[PDB]
Tab-separated table of C-alpha atoms in Angstrom:
chain	number	residue	atom	x	y	z
A	305	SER	CA	36.550	-10.836	-51.102
A	306	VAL	CA	35.980	-8.142	-53.741
A	307	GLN	CA	37.506	-8.790	-57.180
A	308	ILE	CA	37.030	-5.687	-59.309
A	309	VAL	CA	38.154	-6.614	-62.837
A	310	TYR	CA	37.723	-3.090	-64.199
A	311	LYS	CA	38.669	-3.187	-67.913
A	312	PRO	CA	37.464	-0.127	-69.873
A	313	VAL	CA	38.868	-0.821	-73.333
A	314	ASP	CA	38.612	2.121	-75.698
A	315	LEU	CA	39.639	2.583	-79.368
A	316	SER	CA	37.267	5.466	-79.976
A	317	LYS	CA	38.676	7.607	-82.784
A	318	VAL	CA	36.919	10.959	-82.351
A	319	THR	CA	37.890	12.805	-85.447
A	320	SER	CA	37.350	15.501	-88.017
A	321	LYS	CA	38.393	16.181	-91.615
A	322	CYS	CA	38.075	19.694	-93.070
A	323	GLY	CA	39.538	20.622	-96.466
A	324	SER	CA	39.627	24.393	-96.025
A	325	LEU	CA	38.378	26.204	-92.935
A	326	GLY	CA	38.115	29.752	-94.225
A	327	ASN	CA	36.874	33.311	-94.559
A	328	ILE	CA	35.346	33.790	-91.085
A	329	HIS	CA	34.476	37.297	-89.919
A	330	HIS	CA	33.195	38.787	-86.669
A	331	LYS	CA	32.418	42.481	-86.122
A	332	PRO	CA	30.855	43.154	-82.695
A	333	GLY	CA	30.058	46.767	-81.780
A	334	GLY	CA	30.289	48.313	-85.223
A	335	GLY	CA	28.023	51.198	-84.205
A	336	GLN	CA	28.419	54.076	-81.799
A	337	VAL	CA	27.822	53.862	-78.066
A	338	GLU	CA	26.995	57.022	-76.090
A	339	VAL	CA	26.250	57.423	-72.403
A	340	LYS	CA	25.321	60.564	-70.474
A	341	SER	CA	24.861	60.358	-66.730
A	342	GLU	CA	23.934	63.174	-64.357
A	343	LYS	CA	23.144	63.895	-60.701
A	344	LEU	CA	23.432	60.227	-59.811
A	345	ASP	CA	23.711	59.303	-56.138
A	346	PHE	CA	25.003	55.896	-55.125
A	347	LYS	CA	25.343	54.581	-51.552
A	348	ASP	CA	26.826	51.136	-52.308
A	349	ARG	CA	29.299	49.352	-54.632
A	350	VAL	CA	29.199	49.941	-58.405
A	351	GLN	CA	30.520	48.165	-61.499
A	352	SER	CA	30.407	49.542	-65.059
A	353	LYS	CA	31.464	48.034	-68.416
A	354	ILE	CA	31.019	50.169	-71.557
A	355	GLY	CA	32.168	49.238	-75.070
A	356	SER	CA	33.196	46.066	-76.839
A	357	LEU	CA	34.006	43.440	-74.190
A	358	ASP	CA	34.628	39.713	-73.777
A	359	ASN	CA	34.095	38.968	-77.472
A	360	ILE	CA	35.406	35.640	-78.626
A	361	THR	CA	36.135	34.021	-81.966
A	362	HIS	CA	37.165	30.525	-81.169
A	363	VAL	CA	37.939	28.796	-84.472
A	364	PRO	CA	39.544	25.406	-83.682
A	365	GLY	CA	40.705	23.668	-86.871
A	366	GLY	CA	40.078	20.554	-84.788
A	367	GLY	CA	38.011	21.312	-81.673
A	368	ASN	CA	37.381	17.679	-80.675
A	369	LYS	CA	36.677	17.457	-76.954
A	370	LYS	CA	36.697	14.076	-75.224
A	371	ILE	CA	35.850	14.038	-71.575
A	372	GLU	CA	36.023	11.031	-69.319
A	373	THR	CA	35.710	9.804	-65.736
A	374	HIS	CA	36.504	6.467	-64.076
A	375	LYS	CA	35.411	6.876	-60.452
A	376	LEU	CA	35.872	3.476	-58.765
A	377	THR	CA	34.696	4.174	-55.209
A	378	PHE	CA	34.785	1.691	-52.327
A	379	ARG	CA	33.396	1.656	-48.759
Y	305	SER	CA	40.816	-8.943	-49.186
Y	306	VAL	CA	40.268	-6.306	-51.886
Y	307	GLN	CA	41.810	-7.031	-55.301
Y	308	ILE	CA	41.353	-3.973	-57.498
Y	309	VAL	CA	42.494	-4.979	-61.000
Y	310	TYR	CA	42.079	-1.484	-62.440
Y	311	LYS	CA	43.045	-1.663	-66.146
Y	312	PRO	CA	41.858	1.357	-68.178
Y	313	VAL	CA	43.279	0.584	-71.615
Y	314	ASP	CA	43.043	3.475	-74.044
Y	315	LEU	CA	44.091	3.857	-77.717
Y	316	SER	CA	41.729	6.732	-78.400
Y	317	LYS	CA	43.159	8.808	-81.245
Y	318	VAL	CA	41.408	12.173	-80.895
Y	319	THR	CA	42.400	13.949	-84.024
Y	320	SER	CA	41.881	16.590	-86.654
Y	321	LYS	CA	42.945	17.190	-90.260
Y	322	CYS	CA	42.642	20.672	-91.792
Y	323	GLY	CA	44.126	21.523	-95.199
Y	324	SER	CA	44.222	25.301	-94.840
Y	325	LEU	CA	42.961	27.183	-91.796
Y	326	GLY	CA	42.714	30.701	-93.163
Y	327	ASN	CA	41.483	34.256	-93.580
Y	328	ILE	CA	39.938	34.814	-90.126
Y	329	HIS	CA	39.071	38.348	-89.041
Y	330	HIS	CA	37.777	39.910	-85.830
Y	331	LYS	CA	37.006	43.616	-85.367
Y	332	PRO	CA	35.426	44.367	-81.965
Y	333	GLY	CA	34.633	48.000	-81.132
Y	334	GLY	CA	34.887	49.472	-84.606
Y	335	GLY	CA	32.622	52.383	-83.662
Y	336	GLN	CA	33.013	55.311	-81.317
Y	337	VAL	CA	32.394	55.180	-77.584
Y	338	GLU	CA	31.565	58.384	-75.681
Y	339	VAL	CA	30.801	58.865	-72.006
Y	340	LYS	CA	29.870	62.050	-70.152
Y	341	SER	CA	29.389	61.925	-66.406
Y	342	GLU	CA	28.457	64.794	-64.099
Y	343	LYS	CA	27.648	65.595	-60.465
Y	344	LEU	CA	27.923	61.947	-59.494
Y	345	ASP	CA	28.180	61.102	-55.800
Y	346	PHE	CA	29.457	57.714	-54.708
Y	347	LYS	CA	29.775	56.475	-51.105
Y	348	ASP	CA	31.254	53.012	-51.779
Y	349	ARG	CA	33.735	51.172	-54.050
Y	350	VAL	CA	33.657	51.680	-57.835
Y	351	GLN	CA	34.989	49.835	-60.884
Y	352	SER	CA	34.899	51.134	-64.473
Y	353	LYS	CA	35.971	49.552	-67.790
Y	354	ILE	CA	35.548	51.620	-70.979
Y	355	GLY	CA	36.713	50.611	-74.465
Y	356	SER	CA	37.743	47.399	-76.160
Y	357	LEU	CA	38.531	44.829	-73.451
Y	358	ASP	CA	39.143	41.110	-72.954
Y	359	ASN	CA	38.627	40.286	-76.635
Y	360	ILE	CA	39.936	36.931	-77.710
Y	361	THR	CA	40.679	35.239	-81.010
Y	362	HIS	CA	41.695	31.759	-80.132
Y	363	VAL	CA	42.483	29.957	-83.393
Y	364	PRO	CA	44.076	26.582	-82.521
Y	365	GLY	CA	45.249	24.772	-85.667
Y	366	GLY	CA	44.604	21.705	-83.521
Y	367	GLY	CA	42.522	22.535	-80.434
Y	368	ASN	CA	41.877	18.926	-79.362
Y	369	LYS	CA	41.152	18.786	-75.640
Y	370	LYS	CA	41.155	15.443	-73.838
Y	371	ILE	CA	40.289	15.485	-70.193
Y	372	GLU	CA	40.442	12.527	-67.872
Y	373	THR	CA	40.107	11.378	-64.265
Y	374	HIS	CA	40.884	8.077	-62.529
Y	375	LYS	CA	39.772	8.565	-58.921
Y	376	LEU	CA	40.215	5.203	-57.158
Y	377	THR	CA	39.022	5.979	-53.625
Y	378	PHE	CA	39.089	3.560	-50.690
Y	379	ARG	CA	37.681	3.604	-47.130
Z	305	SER	CA	20.689	114.308	-122.204
Z	306	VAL	CA	20.868	111.610	-119.515
Z	307	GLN	CA	21.130	112.827	-115.905
Z	308	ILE	CA	21.689	109.821	-113.662
Z	309	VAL	CA	21.458	111.096	-110.071
Z	310	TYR	CA	22.417	107.754	-108.530
Z	311	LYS	CA	22.376	108.207	-104.723
Z	312	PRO	CA	22.326	104.901	-102.795
Z	313	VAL	CA	22.457	106.102	-99.193
Z	314	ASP	CA	23.080	103.337	-96.687
Z	315	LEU	CA	23.376	103.335	-92.861
Z	316	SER	CA	22.535	99.665	-92.502
Z	317	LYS	CA	24.123	98.379	-89.296
Z	318	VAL	CA	24.254	94.604	-89.788
Z	319	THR	CA	25.266	93.367	-86.415
Z	320	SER	CA	25.486	90.682	-83.787
Z	321	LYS	CA	25.912	90.498	-80.008
Z	322	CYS	CA	26.943	87.217	-78.355
Z	323	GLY	CA	27.888	87.015	-74.668
Z	324	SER	CA	29.802	83.737	-74.760
Z	325	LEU	CA	30.240	81.613	-77.873
Z	326	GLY	CA	31.370	78.332	-76.367
Z	327	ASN	CA	31.874	74.600	-75.990
Z	328	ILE	CA	31.539	73.532	-79.647
Z	329	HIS	CA	32.666	70.051	-80.662
Z	330	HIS	CA	32.962	68.200	-83.965
Z	331	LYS	CA	34.119	64.585	-84.342
Z	332	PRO	CA	33.833	63.326	-87.944
Z	333	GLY	CA	35.016	59.782	-88.692
Z	334	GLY	CA	35.178	58.456	-85.155
Z	335	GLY	CA	34.784	54.866	-86.361
Z	336	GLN	CA	36.978	52.560	-88.383
Z	337	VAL	CA	37.180	52.544	-92.164
Z	338	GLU	CA	38.360	49.407	-93.991
Z	339	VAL	CA	38.709	48.778	-97.705
Z	340	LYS	CA	39.782	45.608	-99.507
Z	341	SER	CA	40.108	45.650	-103.272
Z	342	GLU	CA	41.129	42.777	-105.535
Z	343	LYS	CA	41.580	41.844	-109.200
Z	344	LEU	CA	40.329	45.235	-110.322
Z	345	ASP	CA	40.943	46.257	-113.928
Z	346	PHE	CA	40.701	49.892	-114.944
Z	347	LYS	CA	41.166	51.285	-118.474
Z	348	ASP	CA	40.685	55.006	-117.729
Z	349	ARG	CA	41.480	57.694	-115.114
Z	350	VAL	CA	40.843	57.051	-111.402
Z	351	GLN	CA	40.483	59.175	-108.267
Z	352	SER	CA	40.245	57.835	-104.700
Z	353	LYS	CA	39.726	59.594	-101.340
Z	354	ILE	CA	39.644	57.437	-98.184
Z	355	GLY	CA	39.435	58.727	-94.602
Z	356	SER	CA	38.468	61.973	-92.938
Z	357	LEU	CA	38.529	64.725	-95.582
Z	358	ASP	CA	37.434	68.316	-96.175
Z	359	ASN	CA	35.825	68.649	-92.741
Z	360	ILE	CA	35.163	72.180	-91.633
Z	361	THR	CA	34.314	73.883	-88.365
Z	362	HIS	CA	33.759	77.468	-89.231
Z	363	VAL	CA	32.905	79.291	-85.999
Z	364	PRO	CA	32.892	83.054	-86.733
Z	365	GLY	CA	32.392	85.067	-83.535
Z	366	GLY	CA	30.869	87.566	-85.958
Z	367	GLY	CA	30.122	85.989	-89.350
Z	368	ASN	CA	28.120	88.920	-90.760
Z	369	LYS	CA	28.224	88.863	-94.552
Z	370	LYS	CA	27.058	91.892	-96.522
Z	371	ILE	CA	27.108	91.604	-100.257
Z	372	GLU	CA	26.360	94.385	-102.680
Z	373	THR	CA	26.306	95.395	-106.342
Z	374	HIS	CA	25.810	98.747	-108.084
Z	375	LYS	CA	25.849	97.946	-111.806
Z	376	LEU	CA	25.044	101.198	-113.647
Z	377	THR	CA	25.131	100.103	-117.296
Z	378	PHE	CA	24.690	102.394	-120.300
Z	379	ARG	CA	24.258	101.846	-124.066
G	305	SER	CA	15.734	113.908	-121.338
G	306	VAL	CA	15.934	111.153	-118.709
G	307	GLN	CA	16.213	112.293	-115.076
G	308	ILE	CA	16.791	109.240	-112.900
G	309	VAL	CA	16.577	110.437	-109.281
G	310	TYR	CA	17.552	107.065	-107.818
G	311	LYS	CA	17.531	107.437	-104.002
G	312	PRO	CA	17.498	104.089	-102.145
G	313	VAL	CA	17.646	105.214	-98.520
G	314	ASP	CA	18.289	102.397	-96.078
G	315	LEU	CA	18.606	102.313	-92.253
G	316	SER	CA	17.776	98.634	-91.970
G	317	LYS	CA	19.384	97.283	-88.800
G	318	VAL	CA	19.522	93.520	-89.375
G	319	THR	CA	20.555	92.213	-86.034
G	320	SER	CA	20.796	89.472	-83.467
G	321	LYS	CA	21.242	89.208	-79.694
G	322	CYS	CA	22.290	85.895	-78.118
G	323	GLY	CA	23.256	85.616	-74.440
G	324	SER	CA	25.177	82.345	-74.613
G	325	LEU	CA	25.602	80.291	-77.774
G	326	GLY	CA	26.749	76.981	-76.344
G	327	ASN	CA	27.264	73.243	-76.050
G	328	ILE	CA	26.912	72.252	-79.728
G	329	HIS	CA	28.041	68.797	-80.824
G	330	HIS	CA	28.324	67.018	-84.168
G	331	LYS	CA	29.487	63.415	-84.629
G	332	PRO	CA	29.185	62.234	-88.256
G	333	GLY	CA	30.372	58.710	-89.086
G	334	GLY	CA	30.556	57.308	-85.579
G	335	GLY	CA	30.164	53.743	-86.861
G	336	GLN	CA	32.353	51.487	-88.944
G	337	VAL	CA	32.535	51.553	-92.725
G	338	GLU	CA	33.712	48.458	-94.626
G	339	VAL	CA	34.042	47.911	-98.354
G	340	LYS	CA	35.113	44.783	-100.230
G	341	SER	CA	35.418	44.907	-103.994
G	342	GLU	CA	36.434	42.086	-106.325
G	343	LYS	CA	36.867	41.233	-110.011
G	344	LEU	CA	35.602	44.645	-111.053
G	345	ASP	CA	36.194	45.746	-114.640
G	346	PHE	CA	35.938	49.400	-115.576
G	347	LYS	CA	36.380	50.871	-119.077
G	348	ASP	CA	35.895	54.574	-118.249
G	349	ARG	CA	36.698	57.208	-115.582
G	350	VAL	CA	36.083	56.482	-111.881
G	351	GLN	CA	35.734	58.538	-108.699
G	352	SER	CA	35.519	57.121	-105.160
G	353	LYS	CA	35.014	58.806	-101.760
G	354	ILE	CA	34.954	56.580	-98.651
G	355	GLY	CA	34.762	57.792	-95.042
G	356	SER	CA	33.796	61.000	-93.303
G	357	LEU	CA	33.836	63.809	-95.887
G	358	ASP	CA	32.729	67.409	-96.397
G	359	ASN	CA	31.138	67.663	-92.948
G	360	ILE	CA	30.474	71.168	-91.761
G	361	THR	CA	29.638	72.797	-88.452
G	362	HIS	CA	29.070	76.400	-89.238
G	363	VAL	CA	28.229	78.151	-85.962
G	364	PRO	CA	28.204	81.928	-86.616
G	365	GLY	CA	27.716	83.871	-83.371
G	366	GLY	CA	26.174	86.417	-85.732
G	367	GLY	CA	25.412	84.913	-89.153
G	368	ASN	CA	23.396	87.869	-90.489
G	369	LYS	CA	23.479	87.893	-94.282
G	370	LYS	CA	22.295	90.961	-96.180
G	371	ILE	CA	22.326	90.753	-99.921
G	372	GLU	CA	21.558	93.584	-102.278
G	373	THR	CA	21.482	94.672	-105.918
G	374	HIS	CA	20.969	98.059	-107.585
G	375	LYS	CA	20.990	97.339	-111.323
G	376	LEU	CA	20.167	100.628	-113.090
G	377	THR	CA	20.237	99.612	-116.762
G	378	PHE	CA	19.773	101.966	-119.714
G	379	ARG	CA	19.322	101.499	-123.487
J	305	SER	CA	10.785	113.478	-120.455
J	306	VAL	CA	11.006	110.667	-117.886
J	307	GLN	CA	11.302	111.729	-114.232
J	308	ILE	CA	11.899	108.632	-112.126
J	309	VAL	CA	11.701	109.750	-108.481
J	310	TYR	CA	12.692	106.350	-107.095
J	311	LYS	CA	12.691	106.639	-103.272
J	312	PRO	CA	12.677	103.252	-101.488
J	313	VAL	CA	12.841	104.299	-97.839
J	314	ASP	CA	13.504	101.432	-95.462
J	315	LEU	CA	13.842	101.266	-91.642
J	316	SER	CA	13.022	97.579	-91.433
J	317	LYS	CA	14.650	96.165	-88.303
J	318	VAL	CA	14.794	92.416	-88.959
J	319	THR	CA	15.849	91.040	-85.653
J	320	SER	CA	16.110	88.244	-83.146
J	321	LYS	CA	16.578	87.900	-79.383
J	322	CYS	CA	17.641	84.556	-77.884
J	323	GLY	CA	18.628	84.201	-74.219
J	324	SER	CA	20.556	80.940	-74.473
J	325	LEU	CA	20.969	78.955	-77.679
J	326	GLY	CA	22.131	75.618	-76.327
J	327	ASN	CA	22.656	71.875	-76.117
J	328	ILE	CA	22.287	70.963	-79.813
J	329	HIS	CA	23.418	67.535	-80.989
J	330	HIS	CA	23.687	65.830	-84.373
J	331	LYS	CA	24.857	62.240	-84.917
J	332	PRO	CA	24.537	61.137	-88.566
J	333	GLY	CA	25.729	57.634	-89.478
J	334	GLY	CA	25.935	56.157	-86.004
J	335	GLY	CA	25.545	52.621	-87.360
J	336	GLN	CA	27.728	50.416	-89.503
J	337	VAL	CA	27.889	50.563	-93.283
J	338	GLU	CA	29.063	47.513	-95.256
J	339	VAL	CA	29.374	47.047	-98.997
J	340	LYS	CA	30.442	43.963	-100.945
J	341	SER	CA	30.727	44.168	-104.707
J	342	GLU	CA	31.737	41.401	-107.104
J	343	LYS	CA	32.152	40.629	-110.811
J	344	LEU	CA	30.873	44.058	-111.771
J	345	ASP	CA	31.443	45.238	-115.337
J	346	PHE	CA	31.173	48.911	-116.193
J	347	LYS	CA	31.593	50.458	-119.664
J	348	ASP	CA	31.103	54.141	-118.754
J	349	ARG	CA	31.914	56.719	-116.034
J	350	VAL	CA	31.321	55.913	-112.347
J	351	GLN	CA	30.985	57.898	-109.120
J	352	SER	CA	30.793	56.404	-105.611
J	353	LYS	CA	30.302	58.015	-102.173
J	354	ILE	CA	30.264	55.723	-99.112
J	355	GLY	CA	30.088	56.856	-95.476
J	356	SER	CA	29.125	60.023	-93.663
J	357	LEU	CA	29.144	62.887	-96.186
J	358	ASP	CA	28.026	66.494	-96.614
J	359	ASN	CA	26.453	66.671	-93.151
J	360	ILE	CA	25.786	70.147	-91.885
J	361	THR	CA	24.965	71.703	-88.537
J	362	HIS	CA	24.384	75.320	-89.243
J	363	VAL	CA	23.557	76.998	-85.925
J	364	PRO	CA	23.519	80.788	-86.497
J	365	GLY	CA	23.044	82.660	-83.209
J	366	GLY	CA	21.483	85.252	-85.507
J	367	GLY	CA	20.706	83.820	-88.955
J	368	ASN	CA	18.676	86.799	-90.215
J	369	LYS	CA	18.738	86.905	-94.007
J	370	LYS	CA	17.537	90.011	-95.832
J	371	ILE	CA	17.548	89.883	-99.577
J	372	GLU	CA	16.760	92.763	-101.869
J	373	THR	CA	16.662	93.928	-105.484
J	374	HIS	CA	16.132	97.350	-107.075
J	375	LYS	CA	16.134	96.710	-110.828
J	376	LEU	CA	15.294	100.034	-112.520
J	377	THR	CA	15.346	99.098	-116.212
J	378	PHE	CA	14.862	101.514	-119.110
J	379	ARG	CA	14.391	101.126	-122.890
């Protein structure tokens, strides 16, 4: 007989206190981009990205991540 | 006989306190983009992106992520 | 007695020959201009210019200048 | 007696020959300009220029300048 | 008696021959300009220029300058 008394107790206060989150700036690709391209032969798939792309400014006033697993496996 | 007393108790206060979340700026692709392209031969699929793309400014006043699994598996 | 035989003879063929004047480009102020300004005190005159201004693209197919003076002064 | 036989003869062919004047480009101020300005006190005149200004692309197919003086002065 | 036989003869062919004047580029101020300015006190005149300014691309297919004086002065 298999008695699994699984008791994960948690009171874990994961926390932050900021007074003023402020004055944040982010200027990707200020300058000039130029691209010349000539007598190019391709014989397979192509991708191109040119410019400002995929730029992120994640500013979470909180941003408290809490990540948990309880895998109780039995064979 | 298999007694699974699974008791995940949680009181976990995942929290933030901000007074003023403020004055956030984000200026991707300020500059000029130019692209010349000439006598190009392709013999397969093509993608192109040109410009400002996929730019994000995620500013969650909270932004508290809490991510959980309880996989109780039995064979 | 003052005999002024002033004879400026001129046959001066000031000239140009262009076959094709072509494909001229001019892109001032491609990028972004930003200006913040705060708690400014002035106690005299002010001028401001902001942006693209006074930009010229003079493309004279000819453009042959010929500039001449004949000051015959007498006291 | 003052005989001034002034005879400036000129046949001076000031000239150009271009076959194809072509493919000229000019990109001033591609990038980004930013200006913050704060708690400034002035007690006299002010000028400001900000951006792309006074940019020239003079492309004279000819552009032959011929500049001349004939000052015959007499006291 | 003052005989001034002034005879400047000129046949001076000042010349150029270009086959193809071509593919000229000029990119001033590609990059980013930034200016912060704070608690500044002035007690006299001010000028400011910020950015791309006064940029020239003079491309004279000819561009033959011929500059001349004939000052015949008499006392």
